[PDB]
Design a protein around this nucleic acid. Structure first.
Ligand SMILES: [Mg+2]
Ligand SMILES: [Mg+2]
Ligand SMILES: [Mg+2]
Ligand SMILES: [Mg+2]
Ligand SMILES: [Mg+2]
Ligand SMILES: [Mg+2]
Ligand SMILES: [Mg+2]
Ligand SMILES: [Mg+2]
Ligand SMILES: [Mg+2]
Ligand SMILES: [Mg+2]
Ligand SMILES: [Mg+2]
Ligand SMILES: [Mg+2]
Ligand SMILES: [Mg+2]
Ligand SMILES: [Mg+2]
Ligand SMILES: [Mg+2]
Ligand SMILES: [Mg+2]
Ligand SMILES: [Mg+2]
Ligand SMILES: [Mg+2]
Ligand SMILES: [Mg+2]
Ligand SMILES: [Mg+2]
Ligand SMILES: [Mg+2]
Ligand SMILES: [Mg+2]
Ligand SMILES: [Mg+2]
Ligand SMILES: [Mg+2]
Ligand SMILES: [Mg+2]
Ligand SMILES: [Mg+2]
Ligand SMILES: [Mg+2]
Ligand SMILES: [Mg+2]
Ligand SMILES: [Zn+2]
Lengths: 177, 76, 52, 136, 66, 115
RNA sequence: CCGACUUACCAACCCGAUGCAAACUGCGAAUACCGGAGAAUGUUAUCACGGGAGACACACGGCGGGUGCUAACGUCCGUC
RNA sequence: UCCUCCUAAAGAGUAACGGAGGAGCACGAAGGUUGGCUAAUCCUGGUCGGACAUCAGGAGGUUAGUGCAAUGGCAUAAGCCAGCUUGACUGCGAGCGUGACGGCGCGAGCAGGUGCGAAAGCAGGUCAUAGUGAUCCGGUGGUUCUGAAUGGAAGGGCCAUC
RNA sequence: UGCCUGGCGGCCGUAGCGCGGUGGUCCCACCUGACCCCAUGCCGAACUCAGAAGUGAAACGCCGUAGCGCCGAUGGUAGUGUGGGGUCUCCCCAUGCGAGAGUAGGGAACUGCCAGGCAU
């Protein structure tokens, strides 16, 4: 709740000034944090599904969703109803207590870290980002990972454009470039 | 060879046409879909037959917001 | 197909039976349906047996 | 030549040949040749007229064909008794009703176009005559 | 939030060796330190160091002269 | 979130139109609350018990809560049976029977209704 | 690893324009058909149950058509 | 032998060695009910992820789906999820549509027992149209109906069934 | 009486999309906060409760709006019952019935039982 104690009191004091707004509704707001760590390789063992349904559950304290394949593709050995994906969604204050663990600790901890490039907003300001490995969230034991497989953080926000949604994250000195 | 079969239809359509007087239990329209819809005081059966519940005169009434054919029953 | 005839015997003690068809292959565990009985007038469990 | 790359179903009925035309006036260019009689145009005759008129235009200007044959005419094979089914499609025919246009031309002047359309008229089974570009 | 099927969450100290004391709740249990602190990290003061190009006149006239 | 109420209610309200019983309409707003009854044609209402009529809401503390919903559910029965409306059927209006509607549709039965 | 090159090339999106259809209709007549109210009409001419046989191999002329080539004093139909 | 559209001439029906296709099963839920939800496709961003796995908005609006052929339906969804259940009931049925009949199918309202839901209400199988078969004879389990002098029993009828 | 705003109706694209303004005292949305009341096939996103610091931005109604969609003339068209023909593979005649697409146009809904606020 610490970053949200920072946000409502000391981000609107910039995002009201630099963008010519009337109300407190016109500033963008964060909406949700979603954590997809999909295992597309769980056809050879069910353990690779459920371990990938636990290894991101230990990061942020929720049991995750074993989401299924939507439609069918003959190529990649999938049909309607194969549990391949793992998803976590966070809203409200747990979003802030995870955003703290991302941007204070797990953002410089990644190997060969040189910032996160300035265009990942898909033209509407809703962010997307992707790690390559799990231990950079420091909440894992070292030699207690069966494999290495990253996830992708997606910060869905109420941003409206690429010019006007970026400054929200840049107000928390998001290590762009 | 390839072109030998057919099947005679089940003699469908409108039976008690719009305008005249019917009893209770008789059938108005034996149909495939909900082609003539669930009008006033008619039941749509299992095979979507339009059978009256009251007695009297029938009347073919357009109604609804998507321009659907409702088949009505009022007391003569 | 292999849906064969089976006899649902009333468990009220009376000699009443329905006849249905079940799949011995995919569902080989036995069947207990709580069905109506005309002779004892109450809904009674139906213990299953063969059609003979 | 022209032929359908795809029909939905294989063999069509004969129909009849009543009615006036639809593509009545010149729609693209400057000059036109237009049918008068009532009849039936196969796949071969229109491309034969296309070569016989391209040979007079000498790769100048532009020409448009609009009619495209799609009727699956059939034949019963020779020395087969009349029963035992329909026949297999032999060629593809267009239907031409009185008034329908076939080709249009631009560029090359009209006095050349007289005999340049007359040559392709002389290889066609129904009587046609020339029409001009009408400003509305 | 369901009452049972989600894991533990308790406050634990996360200090760094450059002196960023902090508290965060997690499931890690033990007191967990930090190596790299982003209040003095080499991203805003320490990513110039790689470029290392140099004028070839400078590599020439660093070792001798004429 | 506007279309969900309409789409969940267009089954039961059209089914009451097909029945012909007199319909009890409920409304679940956060601040205020409405309740009323309506003839089998659908366009000639009879009573209106709410909290926008301040004469009843002045003797209640809050407007949109668990006890004030029961207050308006009594205040529709004690102006509907006084005109003599015995035949009634209830539309849940999409907002499900838990809490507010759970008190409103039984404060009427404690205050004498027949459904 | 890349990439500036147009090049008489084709080509889905979509656009202004042009046609065709038994198996597709965002439209759609006439006539034909069921049921009530009525004016004039005809040898009850309309059904009901009961006695008795005939027939169950049809052709041509006009119209809307399906095999056939919009051939046959050709064939298979509903209709006069 | 049965089922779907067209020829078939705006109601039913209407043929050929005419033009094209599917069936002779399944389902203990894929059934009844309550509550809730809404698609195919491409663009853009993203861990291994590629033109097509999963995640994010976003355009667009049934161009998707039904256990299977088409045709007609379908948002109140009859399409898709969770809870509880066995109405996939027993005796009946006014009244009808269509066969030459043997038929076939739909069916409000009643009795007797239930399930769902707070409630009106819905439910006598599955979105409907194919998943098929007369009679004789003969087997099973009830049945006091009969039982060729009487009590019985064999055998026959009776309804359920093969 | 007048205007505005809230659940329900008649209505079935002249009633819907377009783009530009709008109105928050009251109503409505956002919102605020969440342990037992209920809630998620993870999650106060939906679902429920408690309350009103703040905003009318997004939703939601109004006016402006011929880029549409939609309605729609009169006039002409081949079809067409019934009867006579012809140059009978299809058209002409006397009689009625005579539509689809397009031209001139309309066209930014209209109205009713109900409750509140402000005015007359
Ligand atoms: Mg024509
Ligand atoms: Mg035809
Ligand atoms: Mg047609
Ligand atoms: Mg007809
Ligand atoms: Mg006789
Ligand atoms: Mg004969
Ligand atoms: Mg004959
Ligand atoms: Mg003959
Ligand atoms: Mg003929
Ligand atoms: Mg002949
Ligand atoms: Mg002959
Ligand atoms: Mg003969
Ligand atoms: Mg004839
Ligand atoms: Mg017919
Ligand atoms: Mg099923
Ligand atoms: Mg992509
Ligand atoms: Mg349903
Ligand atoms: Mg189903
Ligand atoms: Mg079916
Ligand atoms: Mg005896
Ligand atoms: Mg004896
Ligand atoms: Mg505007
Ligand atoms: Mg606006
Ligand atoms: Mg909200
Ligand atoms: Mg006309
Ligand atoms: Mg017109
Ligand atoms: Mg308009
Ligand atoms: Mg407007
Ligand atoms: Zn350090």
């Amino acid at each position: 709740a610490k970053l949200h104690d920072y946000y409502k009191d000391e981000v609107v004091k910039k995002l009201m000034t630099e963008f010519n707004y009337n109300s407190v509704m016109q500033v963008p707001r964060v909406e949700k944090i979603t954590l997809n760590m999909g295992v597309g390789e769980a056809i050879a063992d069910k353990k690779l599904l459920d371990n990938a349904a636990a290894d991101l559950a230990a990061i942020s304290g929720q049991k995750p969703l074993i989401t299924k394949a939507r439609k069918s593709v003959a190529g990649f050995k999938i049909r309607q109803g194969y549990p391949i994906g793992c998803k976590v969604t966070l809203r409200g204050e747990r979003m802030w207590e995870f955003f703290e663990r991302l941007i204070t600790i797990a953002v410089p901890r990644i190997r060969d870290f040189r910032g996160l490039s300035a265009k990942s907003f898909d033209g509407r300001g809703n962010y997307s980002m992707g790690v390559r490995e799990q231990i950079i969230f420091p909440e894992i034991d070292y030699d207690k990972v069966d494999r290495v497989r990253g996830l992708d953080i997606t910060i869905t926000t109420t941003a409206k454009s690429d010019e006007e949604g970026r400054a929200l994250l840049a107000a928390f000195d998001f290590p762009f470039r | 060879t390839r072109n030998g079969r057919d099947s005679e239809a089940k003699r469908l359509g409108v039976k008690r046409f719009g305008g005249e007087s019917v009893l209770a239990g008789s059938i108005i329209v034996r149909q495939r879909g909900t082609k003539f819809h669930a009008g006033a005081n008619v039941g749509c059966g299992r095979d979507h037959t339009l059978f009256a519940k009251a007695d009297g005169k029938v009347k073919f009434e357009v109604k609804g917001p998507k321009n659907r054919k409702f088949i009505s029953i009022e007391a003569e | 197909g292999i849906r064969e005839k089976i006899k649902l015997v009333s468990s009220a003690g009376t000699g009443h039976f329905y006849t249905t068809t079940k799949n011995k292959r995919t569902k080989p565990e036995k069947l207990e349906l709580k069905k109506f009985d005309p002779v004892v007038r109450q809904h009674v469990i139906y213990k299953e047996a063969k059609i003979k | 030549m022209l032929q359908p790359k795809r029909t939905k179903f294989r063999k069509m009925h004969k129909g009849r040949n009543r009615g006036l035309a639809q593509g009545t006036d010149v729609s693209f260019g400057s000059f036109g040749l237009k049918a008068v009689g009532r009849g039936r145009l196969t796949a071969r005759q229109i491309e034969a007229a296309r070569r016989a008129m391209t040979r007079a235009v000498k790769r100048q200007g532009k020409i448009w064909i609009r009619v495209f044959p799609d009727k699956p005419i059939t034949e019963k094979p020779l020395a087969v008794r009349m029963g035992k089914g329909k026949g297999n499609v032999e060629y593809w025919v267009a239907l031409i009703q009185p008034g329908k246009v076939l080709y249009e031309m631009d560029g090359v002047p009209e006095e050349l176009a007289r005999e340049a359309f007359k040559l392709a008229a002389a290889k066609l089974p129904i009587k046609t005559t020339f029409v001009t570009k009408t400003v509305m | 939030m369901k009452k049972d099927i989600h894991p533990k969450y308790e406050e634990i100290t996360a200090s760094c060796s450059c002196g960023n004391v902090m508290k965060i709740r997690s499931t890690v249990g033990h007191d967990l330190n930090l190596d790299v602190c982003s209040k003095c990290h080499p991203f805003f003061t320490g990513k110039q160091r790689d470029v290392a190009t140099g004028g070839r006149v400078d590599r020439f006239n660093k070792r001798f002269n004429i | 979130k506007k279309s969900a109420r309409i789409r969940r209610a267009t089954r039961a309200r059209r089914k009451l139109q097909e029945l012909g019983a007199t319909r009890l309409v409920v409304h679940r707003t956060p601040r205020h609350i409405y309740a009323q009854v309506i003839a089998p044609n659908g366009s000639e209402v009879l009573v209106a018990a709410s909290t926008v009529e301040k004469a009843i809401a002045e003797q209640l503390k809050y407007t949109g809560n668990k006890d004030a919903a029961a207050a308006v559910g009594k205040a529709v029965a004690e102006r509907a049976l006084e005109k003599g409306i015995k035949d009634v059927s209830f539309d849940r209006s999409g907002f499900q029977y838990h809490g507010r509607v759970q008190a409103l549709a039984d404060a009427a039965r404690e205050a004498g209704l027949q459904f």
